Amino acid sequence: THKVYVELQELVMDEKNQELRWMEAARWVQLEENLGENGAWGRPHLSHLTFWSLLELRRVFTKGTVLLDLQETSLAGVANQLLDRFIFEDQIRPQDREELLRALLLKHSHAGELEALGGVKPAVLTRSHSSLETQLFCEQILEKIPPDSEATLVLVGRADFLEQPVLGFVRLQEAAELEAVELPVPIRFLFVLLGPEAPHIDYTQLGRAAATLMSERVFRIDAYMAQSRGELLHSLEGFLDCSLVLPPTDAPSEQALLSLVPVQRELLRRRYQ
Amino acid sequence: PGTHKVYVELQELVMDEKNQELRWMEAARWVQLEENLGENGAWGRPHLSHLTFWSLLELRRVFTKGTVLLDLQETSLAGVANQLLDRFIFEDQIRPQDREELLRALLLKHSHAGELEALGGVKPAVLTRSGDPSQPLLPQHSSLETQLFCEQLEKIPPDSEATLVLVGRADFLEQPVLGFVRLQEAAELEAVELPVPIRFLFVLLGPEAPHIDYTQLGRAAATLMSERVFRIDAYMAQSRGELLHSLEGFLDCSLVLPPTDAPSEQALLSLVPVQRELLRRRYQS
Structure with missing residues (x-):
């Protein structure tokens, strides 16, 4: 059994060079801390999920491509096997493989490099408003991470060429320090969510939902012991069974959450049974 | 119209224990706040309506292909049932052979909490190909709200109009169906003991399916009706697309709280x- 550090990355371009790359969006250690503009992490909070994010997460997980006990120690190899499996399960077309590989092997720069760039803007991958959590918690690590920790990387992007959103779940055979993507703790799991623009599909929220799911103890244990996609799907159904939906009400916020x-x-109690 | 407050009643198609006879028993009621009915027949403490993910998922699924009777000119539940079944048949929601049993079931006795002591109790039931009740085959889940709020009406404004949500299970039905009815004139129906006119009527019928709890589906429909914005949109809806847009906006501002290892209750205040x-995004529409 291991603890988890979940890091969520997104496809952006810097302002100075206009180069596509991956930017940290949020991180999960014990609570979710979101990265706002000017390169400062927000106040830690519980991960709250939109309804559409979980709906689409279940939709993409049901048909998702899963690579359990994959023997790769580099991000390039993981991406290669993942794209081959994407083609195999008819998720993506063979013409999309090269551009998806070019996207997945870009530079995964970090928070400190934000000031070196001077600005970062969202992006849609091509052939050839602000987040709610950023607005609420970001308008104003190593010590926290236990030593026996295995990291999870959630990669999220929007690609115009893709005809449908795709999920890729990868569990490495052994944890690896990917030289492409540096993290405090070695990476074991890997979420890849890529997709075309679509209604009710906010990819930042989809990555948030996947990272929150990975942060949960029951699903993390199940994903460690999973030997097929069906076990992960069963764990996801159990996760949604114990989820609580709060409809819009006019009641006071503190009273609503205390009640x-x-x-x-x-x-x-039902989740841990 | 509306926009102040309404009374929503949810009733389940159940069978009594005295005669094993199918009927309708009220399961919950809403006056800005939900109260559930216990087995003993006493209403629980009022609480803010929390919804399950599956209930909202399936409510959206049945609402997207739902059958809507707007500005319907009937004042009795029999006429509303006849028109709703005719439109179900026209829209290929139920087969014409299902009409007789469905009309009988919809027009059965709508009992309330006062009658619950005279009967031997209420247990879950499923409508069969005939009028006979059948015990559910899937594992019945005891109500969460009954467990956490029941183990222990002057708030209605005079000008308000009520809403009735009917949920039942019939094994002969191919898929779950939704019937949304807005009466042209609000009328008192025999299904509600309270002297509040009924403007809106939700009918949710279907087979026993996994991840489909019909009590939770009715709770989701009643919570949707209790919301001010959807209620205004439903009053001003001339088509099913407007109701679908209102439900989509309702789900846009619905917040899901996932399970977590350590509930601090202090960072829940975040x-x-x-x-x-x-x-705020809800009331801007």
Whole structure:
């Protein structure tokens, strides 16, 4: 059994060079901390999920490409095997493989490099508004991470060429320090969510949902012991069974969340049963 | 119209224990806040309506292909049932052979909490190809709200109009169906003991399916009706597309709280701005 550090990256371009790359969006250690503009992490908070993010997460996980016990120690090899499996399960077309590989092997720069760039803007991959969490918590690590920790990387991007959104779940045979993508702790799991623009599909929220799912203890244990996609799907159904949806109400916010405590406690009890 | 507050009643198609006879028993009621009915027949403490993910998922699925009777000119539940079944048949939702049993079931006795002591109790039931009740085959899940709020009406404004949500299970039905009815004139129906006129009527019928809890589906429909914005949109809806857009906006501002290992209850207060901002995006429509 291991703890987890989930890092969520997104496809952006810098302003200075106009070069496509991967930017950290949020990280999960014990609570979600989002990276706002000017390169400062926001106040830690629980991960809250939109309904559409979980709906689309289940939709892409049901048909998702899963590579359990994959023997690769580099991001290039993981991406190569993942794209081959994407072609094999008819997720992506063989013409898309080269451009998806070029996207997945870009520079994964970090928070400190944001000031070196001087600005970062979202992006859509091509052949050839601000986030709610950023608006609420970002308008204003190594010590926290346990030593026996295995990292999870969630890669999220939008590609115009892709005809449908695709999920790729990769579990390495052994944890690896990917020289392409540096993290405090070695990487074991890998989420890849790529897709065309689509209604009710916010890819940042999709990556948030995947990272929150990986942060959950029951699903993390199940994904460690999973030997097929069906076990992961069963764990996801259990995760959604114990999820609590809060509809829009006019009640006071603190009273609304305090009154949900008995029900959410019962749901946690059901989750750990 | 509306926009102040309404009374929503949810009733389930169940069978009593005295005669094993199918009927309708009220399961919950909404006056800005939900109360559930216990087995003993006493209503639980009012609480903010929390929804399950599957209930909203399946509510959207049945609403997208739902059958809508807007500005319907009937004042009785029999006429509403006849027109809804005719439109179900016209839209290829139910087969014409299902009409007799469905009309009988929809027009059965709508009992309330006062009658619950005279009967031997209420247990889950599924409508069969005939009128006979059948015990559910899938594993029945005891109600969460009954467990956490029941193990222990002057708020209605005079000008308000009620809403009735009917949920039932019939094994002969091919797929779950939704019937949304907005009456031309709000009328008192025999299904509600309270002297509040009924303007809206939700009918949710279907077979026993996994991840499909019909009590939770009715709770989701009643929570949707209890919301001010959707209620205004439903009053001003001239087509099913407007209702679908309102439900989509409702799900846009719905917040899902996933299970977590350690509930601190202090960092749960970090979801105050989330709820406030989602409500802000809701009321801008």
